[PDB]
Amino acid sequence: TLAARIAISNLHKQTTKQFSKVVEDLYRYVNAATGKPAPMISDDVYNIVMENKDKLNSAIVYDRDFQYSYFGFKTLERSYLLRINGQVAERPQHLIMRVALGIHGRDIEAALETYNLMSLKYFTHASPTLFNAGTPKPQMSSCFLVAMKEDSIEGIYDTLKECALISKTAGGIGLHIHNIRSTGSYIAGTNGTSNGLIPMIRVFNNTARYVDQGGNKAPGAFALYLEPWHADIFDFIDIRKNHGKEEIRARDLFPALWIPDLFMKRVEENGTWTLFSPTSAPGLSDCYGDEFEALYTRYEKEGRGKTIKAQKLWYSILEAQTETGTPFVVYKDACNRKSNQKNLGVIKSSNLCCEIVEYSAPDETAVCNLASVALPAFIETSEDGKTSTYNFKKLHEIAKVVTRNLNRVIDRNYYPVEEARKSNMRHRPIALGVQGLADTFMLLRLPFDSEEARLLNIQIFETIYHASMEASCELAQKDGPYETFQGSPASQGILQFDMWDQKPYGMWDWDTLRKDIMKHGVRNSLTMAPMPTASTSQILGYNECFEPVTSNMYSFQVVNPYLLRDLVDLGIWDEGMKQYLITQNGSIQGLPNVPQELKDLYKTVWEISQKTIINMAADRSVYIDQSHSLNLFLRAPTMGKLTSMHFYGWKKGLKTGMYYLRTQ
Amino acid sequence: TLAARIAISNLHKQTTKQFSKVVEDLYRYVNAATGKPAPMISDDVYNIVMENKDKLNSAIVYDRDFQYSYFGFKTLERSYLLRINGQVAERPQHLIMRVALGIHGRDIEAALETYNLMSLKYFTHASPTLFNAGTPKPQMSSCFLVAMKEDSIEGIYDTLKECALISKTAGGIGLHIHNIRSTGSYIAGTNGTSNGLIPMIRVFNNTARYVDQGGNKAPGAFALYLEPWHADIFDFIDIRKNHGKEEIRARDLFPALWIPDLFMKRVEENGTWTLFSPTSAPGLSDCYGDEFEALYTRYEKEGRGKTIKAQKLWYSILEAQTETGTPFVVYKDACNRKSNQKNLGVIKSSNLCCEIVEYSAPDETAVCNLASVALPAFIETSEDGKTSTYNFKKLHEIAKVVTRNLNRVIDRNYYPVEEARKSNMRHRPIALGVQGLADTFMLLRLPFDSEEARLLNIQIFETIYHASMEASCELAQKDGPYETFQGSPASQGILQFDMWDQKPYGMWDWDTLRKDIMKHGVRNSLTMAPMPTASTSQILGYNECFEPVTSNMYSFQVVNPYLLRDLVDLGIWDEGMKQYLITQNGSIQGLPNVPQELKDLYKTVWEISQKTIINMAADRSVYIDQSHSLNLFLRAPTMGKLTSMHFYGWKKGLKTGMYYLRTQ
Numbered sequence A, B: 001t002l003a004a005r006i007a008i009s010n011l012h013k014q015t016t017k018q019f020s021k022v023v024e025d026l027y028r029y030v031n032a033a034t035g036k037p038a039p040m041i042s043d044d045v046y047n048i049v050m051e052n053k054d055k056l057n058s059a060i061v062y063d064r065d066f067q068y069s070y071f072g073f074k075t076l077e078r079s080y081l082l083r084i085n086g087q088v089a090e091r092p093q094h095l096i097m098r099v100a101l102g103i104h105g106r107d108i109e110a111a112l113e114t115y116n117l118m119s120l121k122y123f124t125h126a127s128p129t130l131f132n133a134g135t136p137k138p139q140m141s142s143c144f145l146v147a148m149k150e151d152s153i154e155g156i157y158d159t160l161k162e163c164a165l166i167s168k169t170a171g172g173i174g175l176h177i178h179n180i181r182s183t184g185s186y187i188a189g190t191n192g193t194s195n196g197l198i199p200m201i202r203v204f205n206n207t208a209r210y211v212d213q214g215g216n217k218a219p220g221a222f223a224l225y226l227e228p229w230h231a232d233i234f235d236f237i238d239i240r241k242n243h244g245k246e247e248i249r250a251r252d253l254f255p256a257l258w259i260p261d262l263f264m265k266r267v268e269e270n271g272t273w274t275l276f277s278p279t280s281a282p283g284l285s286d287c288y289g290d291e292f293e294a295l296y297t298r299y300e301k302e303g304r305g306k307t308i309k310a311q312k313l314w315y316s317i318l319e320a321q322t323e324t325g326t327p328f329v330v331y332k333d334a335c336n337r338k339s340n341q342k343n344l345g346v347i348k349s350s351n352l353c354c355e356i357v358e359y360s361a362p363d364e365t366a367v368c369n370l371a372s373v374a375l376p377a378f379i380e381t382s383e384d385g386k387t388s389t390y391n392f393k394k395l396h397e398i399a400k401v402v403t404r405n406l407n408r409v410i411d412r413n414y415y416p417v418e419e420a421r422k423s424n425m426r427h428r429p430i431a432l433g434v435q436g437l438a439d440t441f442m443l444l445r446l447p448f449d450s451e452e453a454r455l456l457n458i459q460i461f462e463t464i465y466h467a468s469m470e471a472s473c474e475l476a477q478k479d480g481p482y483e484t485f486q487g488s489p490a491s492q493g494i495l496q497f498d499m500w501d502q503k504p505y506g507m508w509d510w511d512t513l514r515k516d517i518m519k520h521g522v523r524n525s526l527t528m529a530p531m532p533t534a535s536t537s538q539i540l541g542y543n544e545c546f547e548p549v550t551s552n553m554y555s556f557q558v559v560n561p562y563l564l565r566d567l568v569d570l571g572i573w574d575e576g577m578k579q580y581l582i583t584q585n586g587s588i589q590g591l592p593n594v595p596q597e598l599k600d601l602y603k604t605v606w607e608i609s610q611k612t613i614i615n616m617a618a619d620r621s622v623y624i625d626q627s628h629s630l631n632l633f634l635r636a637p638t639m640g641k642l643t644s645m646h647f648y649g650w651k652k653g654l655k656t657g658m659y660y661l662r663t664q
């Protein structure tokens, strides 16, 4: 509350003032236990700072360090700001400026403009960027989609090294394994039989612990993807279970499903489902939709697998999701039908947070780089006070900058494995998202489930896409289209909402944009992929993501600001009020004396029907180039209740059906 | 007892008679679950059999299948003989003949001579050979000494793949890790710190389970080597412990010590010992003896490590050996001082059974191929009955054949990893050994601890070395010396006993041999390395190794044959006799009515002082080109009792001080 004006002002006492001087300390730094030079800025950047020392130190408006809250800033403090001898050397306005340089190089113009927006909290970059930008070998990329190289030991161990090598800097991982022969399959080279998928998981799990993000930082985090027609499926969904045969689990990895529609059909038609080893049914994961059912269906009839009740596996699945909140569900066909990267071949997985959908292959590791726009920062008191409005014009302007920013990162990024440099330089996927969605709605006195909010959600995401395409367009005008652009849905003028079959909302001239794209190309294969934003929404102080509030009272106990103020204005904020939020989860519902309109504005995500949540997710998805991390929350979860969340969303044509499942 | 004349004769009913016909069944074989051709003979051999069908089927004397005992043969049955549909297709005389071809090619002369000796039980080959010889991709090699490629993730994971790739056919492994930076050391690339050696062990342990020798056969088996000056040493010795912090053990690997003399000195002088990370003290394992102490000593004084009491670590060690029977102790200097491969660089480890000492490096994986001569088979009733003798003339003749055999294997072997083909083709190490040593002594009415037995042990091993060198010499006459011969102790005329500083015993003309070696070279870098022989001594029916009997009564309960007969001749074999062997471990000592000379002949290895055992080990070692697997057995093990076994043997200049430690 007050210890934010106080712990911020304390580090202002115990830290150097001039920027160029902080760079100097970092650049010159030497590990004392080893007498070894351990610089924390790169040559390229160090130089830049020096040759503009005056222009740069006089940019940094230091009164801007007071835009961060209590835990906003103590998060920047504990893990983000660069550290001399356990002592913090970087002020928050120093991390920003360094990030801006780390991104912009000799374009000190772009640098300064990027510095201003980050300091006035218009937007921010994902954690890898904030940590590493402007430093010796800058690894600014959050996520990696990796292919299992081949159904062999060589392939397996080659993929296992790669995962270590990636895990050792720090990037999540999405690995897919559709091709590993299942328990029992023959091996020609040793007249032997396979123990299947689980022991293989176990090795990876293991490397995931050993390679603790560059030694002593964070233990690795892997998402693994399968298609539910793989014969090891029952054991694969159970990987995070709490009970028995320890030798058969793998508690530090996340199972995700790559779900073909056929599967969903079978389940609702209460029919059969057939399980295969990839060696008996080759090719199932190198095609989708119709061509897939044609081929799946034939393999089937040919006696090639083991059939059970489609519904047996489904029950298995819901059982696991209820207990672990996993596996995730990403819809394979939905993904491939509506991806701008379809000319590349069949996309085989998503990432760790289920927002990225990008082509991956043995020699191509899909990479993506994220930033998030701060939705609340564009709200303004109207043109006659006593009333508020949203500035879509600025938002558009802003998304353009972040779009350009995310490009430079592609060029100035340091790549852990050659597969990822090959991948990223060819297709250039970028990933924008949002935060403060629930805050924006709140500020505007629009409940999350209203028709105004529903409308707002649509138009916010419209301008963000339209902008991120406009600017990807200008860049292709300057630097050429991405190399793999010829052939894409985009090159024909098919944009994201076109392939969902909808007219756009229309707040922006889509006809003109498409004309230019068709004409000159765009720089990026992809652009929009709203992410969890867990770490960075904390720092800016917004509710993460697009999810609504889980609670109006967090934990040290902090009550939702926007509500807090409302209560005291309505002269009802005493102690009885504080105490009916403490044990009762922070739900202002059914509460002795609180106006029905506040009750409508301050709903906990458990009080929003998951039918409404899905709808809005389905609405913004028309402008989402990739997918998005859709978490689901039920209180009293019956088997059927889950069953209609999955089916509803699938029938909505969602790419990501479910990320997590938070329960109870 | 009788069910060996009965279970052997039963498979004679349920198996094809003609050899060429069995080859045919194998060669043509098709896995029914996959409709895939799975031949069990190679093209090369299949052809050979066909084009000599008549000469070959009429070689096989089938009355020779009755030379195997009860569990001798049911061991050949359960795991050795090739199997059609879980049905056995190969007779024992078929496995032999196939092995002989698998080895000898178009030299059908050598083939037939090799077939005869194997069937009359003159000698045999190690398990990889018996299994694989003459089959599609013949992997005939028991052991692999592997180098940790480099102190990096790339290096670590590159070594981990290699180990999988090796483990997947089936060869033990000796890996050494002297160079991996220890807990806490700095990492430049991620401004981080190392969790050290244990988690690294844990990954390897893991790959060792996953890669179950070609899928569904045997779980992998790794020996790991360290020098006790490595800072993770206390945790490394404890790897097989039975108690706490599960996250800190690794129960499926074997710790072994590469022990520098300095360490032993410090311990007996009750002085200091200093622990280093290889990154603080680089080079300790790329030198030995004096140059090492010079360098170790300096690093020390320079403040580079952490000193404790030499004796602290020693106590740690004996504590672990008492409880687990591990780590093994191989003496580094002893090994390098007296190796014919010293011109190659510094040998850094032994194998899994502690008998191999061969040069290894990141790109060179040391390989060795074993066989074992059947010591009893050369005993003969003298030249006037009523008395026995040993035919050293035949033994010599025989060791020559096995020597030639072991060569062809080098050329016809299929190599799992390129490192091992490079290694083996350059240096050509071969490994002969023995079995039936305790049987030989018994047959001859010479107690294991006598002066006659002591003499016999010396001369047996003399002729075996002299022969294996003579024939390696003739081969260098035919095919050229091994490529790395120029420079060796051998090229100068320095033979194995010379570098122990002893005159040979003299039963064979050593002057003439050395003349030829100096003149023409020898084919092999090394030749003699007596092994555990566990699996194959079972089959031929001899007591394994050179170790004496552990028991006169095994388990179905079988009593030592040579004793059994003695008792019934001495008219004292009733039931009371049987019953004073059952619970009382099979020790005929201090027993109501059994002649003191039998008591002297039928000693259990626990009743032989380990001082005697060491002496004989020290005696034969002068003719052992490599080292040998020296197991130790104590009943009432005090700390000091162990301490003088280690020190005694070290001062004896033994290379392998201790393999296992069987206790209680």
Ligand SMILES: Nc1nc2c(ncn2[C@H]2C[C@H](O)[C@@H](COP(=O)(O)OP(=O)(O)OP(=O)(O)O)O2)c(=O)[nH]1
Pocket: A150, A151, A152, A153, A154, A180, A181, A186, A187, A188, A189, A190, A193, A194, A195, A196, A199, B167, B168, B210, B211, B212, B213, B214, B215, B216
């Ligand atoms: N659990 C276990 N799995 C194995 C082992 N060896 C191979 N595999 C599994 C993993 C791979 O997905 C599959 C194929 O391995 P490879 O391609 O190295 O087998 P190879 O080329 O000898 O035989 P193939 O012709 O592919 O059947 O076999 C083993 O020793 N243990």
Ligand SMILES: Nc1nc2c(ncn2[C@H]2C[C@H](O)[C@@H](COP(=O)(O)OP(=O)(O)OP(=O)(O)O)O2)c(=O)[nH]1
Pocket: A167, A168, A210, A211, A212, A213, A214, A215, A216, B150, B151, B152, B153, B154, B180, B181, B186, B187, B188, B189, B190, B193, B194, B195, B196, B199
């Ligand atoms: N536990 C753990 N150990 C690591 C990690 N990254 C590296 N290591 C250890 C294993 C290696 O023996 C040692 C060196 O690894 P590298 O050569 O790949 O480190 P790099 O080249 O970045 O730094 P260097 O210049 O060698 O300190 O660091 C990690 O994320 N976790």
Ligand SMILES: [Mg+2]
Pocket: A151, A152
């Ligand atoms: Mg294969």
Ligand SMILES: [Mg+2]
Pocket: B151, B152
């Ligand atoms: Mg390195």
